[model samples]
Structure formats: structure tokens, C-alpha cells
Target: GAAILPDLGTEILIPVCAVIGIAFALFQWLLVSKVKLSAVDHNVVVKCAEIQNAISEGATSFLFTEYKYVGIFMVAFAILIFLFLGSVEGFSTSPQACSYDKTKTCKPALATAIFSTVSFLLGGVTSLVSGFLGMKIATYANARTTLEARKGVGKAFITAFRSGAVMGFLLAANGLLVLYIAINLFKIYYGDDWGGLFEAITGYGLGGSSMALFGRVGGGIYTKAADVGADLVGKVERNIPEDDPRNPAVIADNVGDNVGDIAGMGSDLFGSYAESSCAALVVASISSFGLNHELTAMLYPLIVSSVGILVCLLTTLFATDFFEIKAVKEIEPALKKQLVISTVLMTIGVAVVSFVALPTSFTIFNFGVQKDVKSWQLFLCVAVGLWAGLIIGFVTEYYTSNAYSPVQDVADSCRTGAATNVIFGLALGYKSVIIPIFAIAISIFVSFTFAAMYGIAVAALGMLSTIATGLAIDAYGPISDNAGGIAEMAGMSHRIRERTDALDAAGNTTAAIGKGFAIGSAALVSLAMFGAFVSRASITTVDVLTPKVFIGLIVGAMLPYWFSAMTMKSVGSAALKMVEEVRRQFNTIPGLMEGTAKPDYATCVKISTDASIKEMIPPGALVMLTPLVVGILFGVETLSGVLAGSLVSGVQIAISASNTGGAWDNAKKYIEAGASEHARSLGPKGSDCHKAAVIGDTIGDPLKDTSGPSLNILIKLMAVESLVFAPFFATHGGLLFKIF
Candidate 1:
């Protein structure tokens, strides 16, 4: 089969696209920076700046402590990868045939081990840096959003969305460039062994996902701990306002938004992008594309991403350039337009890239032989995933967004009591899973029929191709949240609070949009890797009825529940410490309640920070070890059962967890916004409806951001860990089962 795009064009195009994305991000940053607070706002402007500094300082301090441990883990884990993988062939230096084909000689397994170590360290470093940069950008623009709020909701939203775009575009661009450089640099040394090149490259995914797990869990813990303590003590006990300056933990709580929602979420999705791309590359390597040295076709996944950056750039432009938000009601449409515009442009780009880069007819390698695929077929495969994500996004929006009846119904349940709010939200969460489940099912059938696991890999990549848009919205959510935090702290006018409220209202639902997409893609990514793992291990058994698998399956199905209980309890432990400290500050400090003497903000930050890094470890350790123990005790057949069972059992629970959690969170937001008859009547705080709504979002915090959303990474991290260890497990593990 012949390809249409030349190798040189693809090689040049990749870096250029990434460069464009970076430049656009820089422009958005400049835009956000221009939102200076003027003289009319005087004292409040000064106060917003002060609050921003506190947020910036707290985030930097907590992350540094968290990352100090991460730095140690990376070094230790690098050695582990080197030792385990290097021991595969007894550290031999002799060149061997490509694992896929006997006729083709490749680099030594020892060299591959070294490269794997190098890639792992590099990937871990990149993930850490990317997350920190997101936190930096978010903290920088949060004050700007708060300042913009003084004018109107429309103005505040523009600054907030642009701020988010700055983080998203720059993050995507930098991560993309780093990956492209690593590939080209490695390929130069690799010299005709795409087999060895990509095999070593697999470490990047393992490292990225492993690092991401800590960020998600640790940051999630930090934010929720501070949130619950501050809310329970401030809102419920004292009858105080949300994000009140009188609360000792409010500063730490605001900082949690950056650490968990911005940085943690960034790292989580970054990890996803890394694994899906690696899976796509690994499958491509063993296929005819790599074997025949068809560089463009072999790098088709990157090209899709290349066009992805450009499409998102243009889509981002439509919001920032073509139109600006002019009315309060226009903000939601402005944001959704980005997704609508990007998806359409991405469709065209996918079609053209499919036509230009790939052969009309080519072979995709399956277990042992070639499974033929067409360029058009792969095109549809990617499109199916992209469209499915779009479908699921809207379905999620309908269920979680306050504009819809589902959220409205849940919000009204607050009239009954906190328990009813919880009940209604849980019901909404369960039912919301209905459409997305079918969307994923249909998406899987189409892509599966098109090209098996290879298709699945492509589709997962396709699902996240416009992640710049998704990441942008995700960033906007937290930035607006930070704006509200600062708004309350500064004691801004009620008008300003209203603006921030509206921004946060939409921001809440859109963050859920990101969650919904993450759930779908993670499911695809895990399955793709599972498929690759099966092929890599050279396993040839089917096990729907096998006794060994059923044993593994039931245990595997129990995973996320255990994982959830672990995280939820961890949140409680952290919250208890935080709750006491806030109580301590209230009682011990003289005149702190009247703002005569400020509550010690730094101490509460420390309490939250300490709890986060400590609590993250046990849950992190449990998840990190799950795959190794299962493989060592049970064998590959059982391990496969565990992986599938975990995913199957995890997704429904995950989807519901995030949705119900967000539904309740936004239901509270609905009451607070006071934008409508029912909502305004429900609010004014101290009222039963408002009280119940607050309770609703309180418990929802951990479920939504901590356990619910982080579960996506929880599943993938295990999938990647197993894949990295597949060769070892297939050869030597399962001693317990063997002896038994």
C-alpha cells in the first residue's frame, strides 16, 4: 500500500503545529494579564491582590512538599524499571530479532531497558512540570477573574475563560513538543528499529500515569479536606457566608481548587493522552507501517494530534477572537461554541489527515498475523470516538447542568431536606449513566468492527484530540471557583459576587463535562492497553467460562469500592484534623470572628497540606500495588480477568459518582446564584433549603473531585503498570497459583 503524505511533510508539520499551540497560549496569557484593576475599585483591588498572593503561596508550598516525595519516588521507580526489565534476558547485551518478527534484528534488550529508564524519568519530570505550570497559570489569572467580576458577568467570564485557555493551550503545546522531541531524538539513535524505539517508549506512559495518581489523590485530598472543614464550621455552625474570610481554612480551600482541580486534573488527562498515544504507537510499530518504514502512516497518531492542536487553536480563536461575551446569558453559549467549533474543524482535519498520511489499504497486525485496515476505516474509527465524546458531553450536560430539569429537580429536592437532596442526586447520577453507557457501547462496536484494538487505540487518541478545548474548559471551572473565593474574601459588592456566581455556575457543569469525557476515554484506553498486553505477552486463551478468571473477576469487580472507601476515609481523616484546627483558630484567637484579628491562615494551610501528602500515600500504595500482587499471585489469565472486571465494574460507578457529585455541587450553586424565582427563594442562607443545599455539596466534594474523578486514573494507572510488567508476569509470576 502507498501513502499520500510524504514523510518529510509529516515530520515538519508535527513540530510546527505544536509551536503554533504554544504561541496561541502565550497570547491568551497576555490577554489575561491585561485585565488590570483600576482606581475605581481601590481597596477591593488591593484586597484581591492580597488574596491572590495567599493562594499562590499556599499552592506553591503544598505542591513543593508533595513533589519532594514524588522526586524520591521517581528515582526509586527508575531503578525498579531498570532492574525488573533488565533482568528479563539476564541483562544480556547481544542484539536480538524484533519481538514481533524473527528475521529482523533490533537493539539489545539491555539497551531497551536503559532507554525505558530514561523515558520514565523524562516522562515523570514532564508530568510534574506540566502540572506545576498549570497551577502557576491558574493562580496568576484567578485574581484577574476576580477583578473582572467588578464590571459584569460577561467581562469576568472572558477573563476566566481566556485564563483557562492559557493553561490548556500551553499545557497541551509543551507536553506535545516534549513528546515529539523525545521520539525524534530516540528514533535517531534507534535507526530502523521502530520495534525497540516504541517498546522503550512505553515507559513514558507508565511514568506519566504513576506520577498522575499521586497528584490526583493528593491534591484531591487536600482540596476536599479544606473544603469540608471550612464549610462545616463556617457555613453550618456559624451561619456564615461561603468562602468567608473569617474561616481559617478558606485560604487553604481556595488553594485546593488549583492543586486538585487545575493541576491534578491536568496531570490526570495528561497521563491519559500519554498512554493512548503510546498504545497507538506501540501497535503501529509492530504493524506493516513500521516494518516497511512508512513514517507518515506509522506516525499517524501524532499527525492526528498535530491537526488537533491547529483545530483547537482555531476553535479557541472563535471564543477569544470572533466573539466576546456581551451579556450574562451569552456566556454558556460562548463556551459551548468552542466545543462545537472544534469538533467540526477536527472532523475535517481527521478526514484530510486520513487521506494524506495513511495508505488507502494497509495491514494492522493482530495477535500473530496482519489484520487489514483501510484509511477510510481508521478515519471512521477516530470519528466514532470523537463524536461519541461529543454525544456523551451533551448527555452529561443535560444531567449535570443547572439549566436542565435534572439538576433543577435535584435542586428543588433541597426543599424537602438534605437527605432528599442526596437521594435525588444519587438517582440523577445513576440515570445519567444511561445515555453515556449506550454511547460508549455504540462507539465500541463501531470502532471494534473497524479495526479491533488498533482501532480502539486510535479512537481513544481521537477522543482527546481536541483536549485543548476540554482542558481549557476544565481550567476555566477552577479559575472561576477561585474568583468566587477571592470575591468573598475581598468583601466585594453583591453585584461582583453575582458575576462570580454566574461564572462559577457554568464552570461547575463544564468541569463535569471534562469528567464525563475522561470516564469514556479512560475506558477505551484501558481496553486498548489490555489488548496490547495480551498481544505483548503472546497469550492465546479465551476465558469467559474459566474458573480461574471468575475468581479473579469477582475480586477485581470489588476494587473501586475498596479504592473509594480508602479515598473517602482518607478525606475524612484529613478533614478531622482540619476541622479541629479551624475550631482551634476560632476559639483561641481574640476577636478573629469580627475580622479584628485575622485567623492564622498559614496554619490551616499547613494542616490541609500535611494531611494531603500523608493521606495520599496509603491509597496510592494500594492502587500502585494492586496489579503487581494480582499478577504475582494469580497469573496472566487471572490478571486479565482482574483488569477487565475492574474496568467493567469501575466505569458505571465512576460515571455515577462524578455525576451525582456534580449534580449536588451545582444544585448548591443553583441556590446560591439567586438567578431565578425558585433558586433565589431557596437561598438567602440560614434557610432550610439553603442549609440542605450546602450539606448536599459538602459530601459531594470528595465524591466529585476526589474519589469520583480520580477513579479514572486509578483504573488506568493499574492498566499501565500491568502492561509495563507484562513480560515479567507472563514469564515468572503466579507462584502462589502454581504452588496451590
Candidate 2:
């Protein structure tokens, strides 16, 4: 028997929560709109507005160009999906027996091929909108946050947080509603064939990750090129402060904050949410739930998300209205409190939903067998992931935050030189990976023990249950970062810069924590998707000793390094051009360093823009093409090894690279703050210590921002891509194997 909640309850609750989330987002935007700049600060307001306009235009221009290429690729890829899937059934219009139950008549394979392509386009468009909307909101709020800082830290905090909440809720609600709509629309044709229904739906995740691949890599290149160029020239060479108007690349750096950090991150996480849900849905489609036609049980993953939205809504009030920050030190703790409260609240929320939505016991598909699982066990699976996210967050903060000793030690290493700083930073990042990996391992073991891949999929959703708050916090960082940049560009008073700096500093730590969450969830989702792919591809064993598997495994392990090399070198090359451009302006243009003339800002922006747009294609092609090439030319067995090796190897490098870069960044901030005697000994700016720290920071720029975070997309995109093409691979793939 189904649990207490009726199917109607879920159908209503899912959309209702989505509506409420959207309403909340609009309401926050309304409040943010009320925060107008004062007439008394006319000059400052004008300058802030100008800077805002520049950032907004730059981000918009770049995304439009990037999306142009991505959109074309999306169309081309959609054609491939249709042709590949269509060919599986010879494009026959005759109805076929259901894959899950032979007695039932299902839609023809051609129908699924068409609908899958449609859903892929739907998802790709949604992902593009998610990133674009985030960029718009971030640009809109940056200047407002800067203006609000005049009132106090709390005022600026509210503006930044609410703006972030707008993006957070919008993305969460929009993604849910769109997916729900997609399911209902496709259900019209699917009828009783839930397995084929969801098999097509898997294309949604593929679409998202595909677009995110370019967005992240392109935006990463754009941001880091400008960032590294600005830092090396402004901080290391000329001793000018960060975000100085005279620095040619400063505007591009600010624009990068929005594009790379905010827009790119939104699309990246949206893909995670979609893939995890899709994985659970596909697995459930053939299980007892789909067989028994239990609608409420079929929607367990969605119910969890619904409850997550409500819990996060309540949790957000604690940050927005329930608490107050009186001092600078309270900022980070206030941000952290949102996570703790949401995790605790969501734990209860998941329990209640589990009890009401899922039966006391049900059989979920475990590999090829149906295994009995209790509602309580499912609750535990979600709970472990929720708690593990918090653990990963705290551990990441300890390693990345300047308030902690790990980053402090990295800062201390600068006493010797950049070389020592680099060495210590590397070691710190490697050491930091130990705990998070263990946490992920435990999550896998516990979840796999109970419900197999279904449990792991649920766990992945569990980690992102508080995505509203997580995104709010994550988006808040870049908003605050851009606010600081606005403040600097507008030549605001030191007091104003001080406040925005405090916000930006905390934002950095929170951003790193967000990356920790992203990395953690990507690992679990990829593994779950891999399991689903294996099942779909009809593979029984993934024997490690086999030569086919071993060769693929080693090659897959090397893919990340290959991908990383391309992205890092792209940033380096672009940054070099930017550096020469900036140096040329400074050396040639009279009074440029004296602040009597503006540097060639447009030139630097063009340099980053062109490089990012051009450089992102190779990495994008690498990820998108590998699975098809391997699965077709070699075999499913080799492709399986590739997936396993990448997951195992990519997770380590992603974690270490992100944390290492985070440590170097905060270490520089630690020295610049110089609030304590130890920090003061490192000097204000232009000191040998500060310059060394800057060098280390520059080296880490691409490591964390460009390669580390984008690697999350690599693992996930490949997994979902493989899963989407499973039918084709199972039937007509392995050309070489067949020929030989």
C-alpha cells in the first residue's frame, strides 16, 4: 500500500513549493529594489552606477557570445541524439512491447527519440537561462550592495544576501517546475511505460552538463586571465591596490567574478540537481514503484526537494531577519549558521516526508535484483549525505579560511619566498583531501549497503537538499566580491572599502565551502549515474584485471590531467597577453600610473573575452566526444573502466586544486589585512612577503577557479552522456570489436 500522502498531494506540493520559491525570489528582489542610492552621495552613486553598467554589459556580451557557440553545439548534439537513438529501432513506427513488462504495449522507439531530443533542448535552454539570470541579478546587486554599505555592514549584507536568495530560489523553483512539466508532458505519450519515459528524461541531465561544460570552462578562462593579469601587474609590479581604476584588467576581473563565480556556478549546480533526480527516477522507473504504479513513491526524490525548499525558506529567515551581525567577526559565523540550521531542519523535514510519502517497506532495484528497503533506511541514506555535506563544508572552511591555521601556515610560508609558499600550499591541499574523501567513502558504503545505486542517488539529492540556502550563500560571495570592486572603482572612502572587504572575505570562505559541496555531490552523482549506465548497457561484471577495462581505466584517469593541462595553459596564455597589454598601456600612456589617465580597459576585456571564447572549445569537445568514441570504437567494457578511473582520480585532483587555490587566496588576504602583529610583520603592500604571497596566489588562480571546479563537470558530464547513449551502445556500438 502507498503511504498516507495521496498522489494528488505530491502533484500539488511540488509545484506549490516551486511557486512559493519564485514568489520569495521576487519579493526579495522587490526589497532590494528599495535600496536606492542617496542624492547626498551623488558623485559616488554616479561612479558606482558607471562601474555597474560596465560589468553588466561585459558579462552580458560574453555570455551571449559563449551561448551562441554552445547553442550551435547543442543543436548539433541534439541531432546526434536523435539519429543515434532513432537508429536503435531502425526508425520503425510500429509499437513495441514494454521493456519492463512484455505484456504491455509501449510507444515506438522513434517517439522516444524525438521526445528525448525535445527534452534535451528544453533542459539546455533552461540551463542557459539559469546562468544568464544569475549574471543579471549579480550585476544589478553589486552597486546596490556597495551603496548599502554606507548604512552599515548589516545593510550591505542584506542586499547581497537577498540578491543571492533571488538567484537561489529562482533557479531551484524554475528547475523543478520545468522538470515536472517535462515529465507530465512526456507522460502523455509514455502511458504505462515509465521505464522508457524516464530513459528519455535522462537526456535532460545531459543537456544541462553539456552547456555547463562550456560555461564553466569559458567563464573560468575569462575570469582567471583577467585576475592573474590584474594581480601580477597591479599588486606585484606596480604596487597599486586591487581593483584600482588605473589597472587595465580590473574591470574584466570584476566581470569575471560574476560570470565565472556566480553564473558558472549556478549552471554547474543546476546540473547536479537535475542529474541526481534523473538518476533516482530512472532507477525507480523499473523497480517495484513503477511496476506497482505508486505515484507518490515514484516522486520520493521530488518530495525530498519540496521539503528542502520549505526547510531552507525557514532557515533563510534566520539569516535575513532572525539574527543580526554587529561586528565583522560575526559575518562568517552567521553564514555558517545558515548551513547548520538548514541541515538540522532538513533532517527533520526529510524524515517527515519519508514517513508520509514512502511506504514502510518497498523493494528497490539493486543491480538486477529487487531488494527490500524500509522507509527508515531510506531516511538514513538521505541523512548521511546531508550530514556529510556539513562535514565537508566545515573541513573545507578550516583549510581555506584565513581565520584557520592551515591557510595561516601557508601565509607564514611566504616568509621564505613564493617557492616555499607554493610547496606548503600544495602539501596543504593534498592533506585537506583526506577527510572529505573519507566522508564520501563512508557515504557510499552506508548508502550502497542499504539500497545500492538508488540509495546513492538519494544520498546525492540529500546533499543538495538545501540547495536554496547553499546557492544563496554561494552566490552571495561573488555579489560581495563585485561590490568591493565597485567600491574600489568608485574611489569610495576607506571605511566603505573596509566593510565590503569584510563581506568579500567571508564570501570567499563560503564560496570555497560551496565548491566543497559541489565536488562532493558530483562524485556521488557520477557514481550513481555510472551504476545506472552499467545496468542499462547490460554489463554484468567490471573485472579490474581485464586488459580492456584496465586500458580504458588508465586512459580515463589521464583525461582529467589532459583536460586540466588545456584549461591551465589557456589561462596562462591569455593572462600573458593581458599582462603585455597592461604593461604597454602603463609604459606608453602618460599619467596612467599617476591616476591622471585611464588605462586601456577595453583592450584587456577583449583579450580575456576572445581567449575564453576560443579556448573553451577543445576541452568541451574532449568531454563530449570521449564516451561516444570509446563506447562505439572499443566497447562497453572499456568505457566502464574509463568511467571508474575518472571518478576515482578526478575527485582527488578537484578537491586538492580547489582547496590549494583557496588557501593561497586567503593567505594573501591575511597578509593584506595586517590586523595582528604577526600579519603586520608581513606588511601592508609591496613588501617582499606580500609579493611572494601574490605570486603564490597567481599560480593558484587557474588551479582552483579554472581546472578544479570545472573537473566536477567533467566527471558528471561523461557519466550522464554515457547513460543517455546506453541504448545505442548496447545495440550497435563496438564497431572494432564486431569487425575484428
lDDT (Cα atoms) of all candidates against the true structure:
0.85, 0.91
What does candidate 2's lDDT look like per residue over 1-740, in tens digits? 68899999989999999999999999999999997753226899988988898899899988998899999999999999999999999999999998677899989989889988988898888888899889999999999999999988998998999999999999998988898899988988888888888888888888888888888999999999999999898888988988999999999999999899988889998888899898889889988888788889898998899888889889989989988787888889989999999999999999999989999989988778989999999999888888989999999999988998999989989999999999999999999999889889998888889888889998999999999999999899999999989999999998998888889888888888988898898888899999999998998988989998999899999999999999999999999999999889888999999999878789989999999999999999999999999999988889999999999999999999999998999898889888678888998778999999999999999999989999999999999999988889989988988998
Whole-structure CA lDDT of model 1: 0.85
Cα lDDT of model 1 by residue, 164-206, tens digit: 8888888788777777888888898789999889878878878
Clash total of candidate 1: 0
**What is the alpha-carbon RMSD of candidate 1 to the true structure?**
1.6
Question: Which segments of model 1 are wrong by more than 4 Å?
Answer: 37-40
Task: Give the TM-score of each candidate.
Answer: 0.98, 0.99
